[PDB]
Structure 1
């Protein structure tokens, strides 16, 4: 059958997994606590169908003598049914089993790239364990998969025929990427991004178990694009007021659009570098304006991948801070029983990732700081989060006040 080339990110993932074959961070993991009755045969059938619909789970990454490639195959898989009701702490035992799974490495040539499992933790409490490899999954795709599985399971339980998936096949993305590889548009994107990162020396960073720290707050003073624009400008201004460097680079993940009308689980976002210059006397207004100008001046070349741009200049990162503004993923129901999704692991982390989580019709925000241990300490990340949020609160109260006239914290 037909084989497709891997992306630059997938090739880097392959090479890093071949370098450190015992590192388990290239596995993202998640679990779904379900408060109700779960019968495992219906769930296994739902997984059987969803794995066929989300064909990124049926990809086989093989090695050749003419290039690393991937193919759509029929990978062998299973779903264990673990019962832990007859033990003292079933929560601890289930978490230990999960931790035992996502801590052992995964071989990419011959081996299972995902893992599904069901656990008894209480008489009416089953947890669905979901592990994937970074080479074929991201968090958004995992949530899409979990939602589709919940819907299909609820449909199969009540005997109804589940509706047709709203997923696009990964082969659409593969063909589009193969045609884009030989694009003249890709050549022009490379030209633009190379002329844009011209005099770009090492960027601004606060770099002095991923360090994760959340903080809930509520600003009283729109859309979800003004929100992300404001958070980008605020993070850049904070880096400029802490490091003293006027030319701040941030990472902005965008969802590339090439013609697909559906979501393709497995298709990842492209993190574009955003360059902001801090002139004296500038305020949040002009910073927002220049950030939007940089966004829409580089959105024309959105498809050029981050990794090709990075190693087309000299590989040690294009940016140290990433802004991820997104609403929460709605809770899912399995057959009529509501479920709560819990992240077990991520792994590949930019040195600092800023995650802002908003809710429709609400003033409450959630600020997450996911950083690299070798670059931050729990006290250093906590002090930075406290300093940035108050600095960001001073920004929201007056968009006309200059950045340099704002006082910083401890």
Structure 2
């Protein structure tokens, strides 16, 4: 009856532009798990599951993106705070012949399965005991309601809450506001004069687009979870180039743009970069996304790392006023054709939690899936004070082979260290492999 139709619309918010394209893609591929994001946290100590589950229940209240329900309507998928029921599996794998390999297999069995958006919860939390004092906390979400930075903040908050509960103290109140504040702010932005100003800016900025520079063999839709190659690199290998995350993002974007130029001849290289890089304990609402926007770097004679990092800073400063305009909206307003993107390669710098601790026991976070890889994505994990960077090259399996991606990864890693060693040397003057 009409009362039920009216109630679904009045109690919900629309999807964002970015969520809309996720939902449309998931609808086209209903059995595909490519929209999952997942990580695990290794705890070097004893975990008490009942206390851990109490900490999870607390964070499920605090990070209310974890309670959003999605409902179909005549006007597309709608979202509101729902009431999912959930449980936390506990698996003791210590009697398996290889508990670590068994834990990886258990996690893979979950993250390779699709979720139905209209049947929540859209998260999974599980505890896997791998050794007497080694636990893995598995965390999986759907990208429509989470990103990797939000997953990082949730892991940090659960660690803090669990630690307070273990000690018998009351956790201090969280610093997250509510996902509803994001939804209300975005609803207002959609009808604002600012959005019209941002549209004009990005339409002008993207004039004369063409196919993005890519190492891909072809362009293809994302039908399968990423092919990944990971490198670990000492921060000292980058010299003075990366004192903080902002500078590291500028360096990696410059280095990849230069590498794409050397491999394609494209002198006007467009990458995807969030206009600002987020870090921990900074009042961010889990589930609120970064808008990845085009970043153009121009290769001209004598171009060097110094000048490219300068262009990257100029691009980011110029886009700051306009940083809310959805990449997804822009890609359509430009009138671009079937499956064509604004950029092939994205760079995502993410924090590393130096102090992560559960009940006094040290822990570390490890990404399993970071969402779909349309072409190529670099995921970089680091925070000042950490002596090592983890760099994930995540690629559409239809566009690269493992060999081919590994060859590009080791060459790029070599190339970036040559750049960091002499920021004045012309890009054209660097030997490649």
What TM-score do the two structures reach when normalised by structure 1?
0.92
Contact 1:255 1:268 survives alignment (8 Å):
no
Residue by residue over 1:162-212, the C-alpha shift from the partner in whole angstroms, topping out at 9 and shown as x without a partner, is 110111111111111000000110011011111111110111111129232
Residue 387 (str. 1) matches residue 396 (str. 2): no
Offset of residue 388 of structure 1: 2.2
Residues 378 and 392 in structure 2, CA contact (< 8 A), matched pair in contact too: yes
1:258 and 1:349 mapped to 2: Cα distance? 23
Distance 1:77 1:254, change over 3 A: farther
1:370 matched to 2:379? The reply is no
State whether residues 94 and 132 of structure 2, in contact with CA within 8 Å, keep that contact through their aligned partners in structure 1.
Answer: yes
CA deviation string 1:233-285 (max 9, x = no partner): 22211211110111110111234999997210000111110112222233333
Q: Deviation at 1:218?
A: 4.9
Asked whether the equivalents of residues 124 and 139 of structure 2 are also in contact (C-alpha less than 8 Å), the reply is yes
Give me the whole-angstrom Cα distance separating, in 2, the residues matched to 1:288 and 1:86.
52
* Higher mean displacement: 162-171 or 105-114: 105-114
Aligned partners of 2:409, 2:109: CA distance in 1, in Å?
A: 32
1:293–1:341 distance in 2 versus 1, CA, 3 Å: closer
Q: State the number of aligned residues.
A: 409
| Alpha-carbon spacing, 1:245–1:148, altered in 2? closer, same or farther (3 Å) | same
Tell me the distance in 1 between the aligned counterparts of 2:419 and 2:276.
Answer: 28
User: Quick one: distance in 1 between partners of 2:367 and 2:303?
Assistant: 40
Deviations 1:328-362 (A, max 9, x none): 23352111122222322233114112234445256
> Contact conserved, 2:269 with 2:298, CA < 8 A, in 1?
yes
> Residues 224 and 124 (structure 1 numbering): CA distance in 2 closer, same or farther, change over 3 Å?
closer
Extract unaligned runs of 5+ from structure 2: 1-9, 219-225, 237-241
Query: Would the aligned equivalents of 2:279 and 2:351 in 1 still touch at CA under 8 Å?
Result: no
Give the Cα–Cα distance (whole angstroms) in 2 for the partners of residues 188 and 177 of structure 1: 16
- Structure 1: which 5+ residue stretches go unaligned? none
1:34-53 equivalences in 2 (<5 Å): 34-53=43-62
Please say which of residues 354-363 and 333-342 is displaced more in the overlay: 354-363
Higher mean displacement: 42-51 or 218-227: 218-227
- SS state of the match for residue 277, structure 2? coil
- 8 A contact 1:29–1:130 mirrored in 2: yes
Once the two structures are superposed, the pairs formed by residues 12-27 of structure 1 within 5 Å of their partners are 12-27=21-36
- The CA deviation at 1:4 is 0.9
Measured on the aligned residues, the alpha-carbon RMSD in Å equals 2.8
Any idea what the Cα deviations from partners look like across 1:119-162, whole Å, max 9, x if unmatched? 23333333222111111011111111111111111111222111
C-alpha contact 2:17 2:326 (8 A) present in aligned 1: yes
Residues 29 and 344 in structure 1, CA contact (< 8 A), matched pair in contact too: yes
Structure 1 range deviating more: 254-263 or 162-171? 254-263
Measure the CA separation in 1 of the matches of 2:301 and 2:72. Answer: 54
Q: Deviations over 1:336-391 (max 9, x none)?
A: 12222232223311411223444525675444322222112222222222322333
Mean Cα deviation higher: 232-241 or 365-374: 365-374
**C-alpha contact 1:25 1:346 (8 A) present in aligned 2:** no
Cα displacement (A) at 1:217? 4.1
1:113 Cα deviation from its structure 2 partner = 0.7
Q: Contact 2:124–2:140 (CA<8 Å) still a contact in 1?
A: yes
Cα shift readout 1:20-52 (whole Å, capped 9, x = no counterpart): 111112111222222322222211211111100
Q: Provide the rounded CA distance (Å) in 2 between the counterparts of 1:33 and 1:284.
A: 37
| 305 and 257 in structure 1: CA distance in 2 versus 1, 3 angstrom threshold | farther
* 2:156–2:356 Cα contact (<8 Å) kept: yes
Instruction: Give secondary structure in 2 for the equivalent of 1:282.
Output: coil
Kept in 1: contact 2:64–2:81 (CA 8 A): yes
TM normalised by structure 2 equals: 0.87
Alignment CA distance shift 1:144-1:297 (3 Å): same
SS at match of 1:275: strand
1:109 Cα shift?
A: 1.2
Q: Report if aligned partners of 1:106, 1:112 keep a CA contact under 8 Å in 2.
A: no
Contact 2:212 2:270 (C-alpha < 8 Å) held by counterparts: yes
Query: Cα deviation per residue 1:308-347 (whole Å; 9 max; x = unaligned)?
Result: 1112223511101112234423352111122222322233
C-alpha distance in structure 1 between counterparts of 2:320 and 2:335, whole Å = 23
Whether 1:124 aligns to 2:133 is: yes
8 A Cα contact 2:244 2:384, kept in partner: no
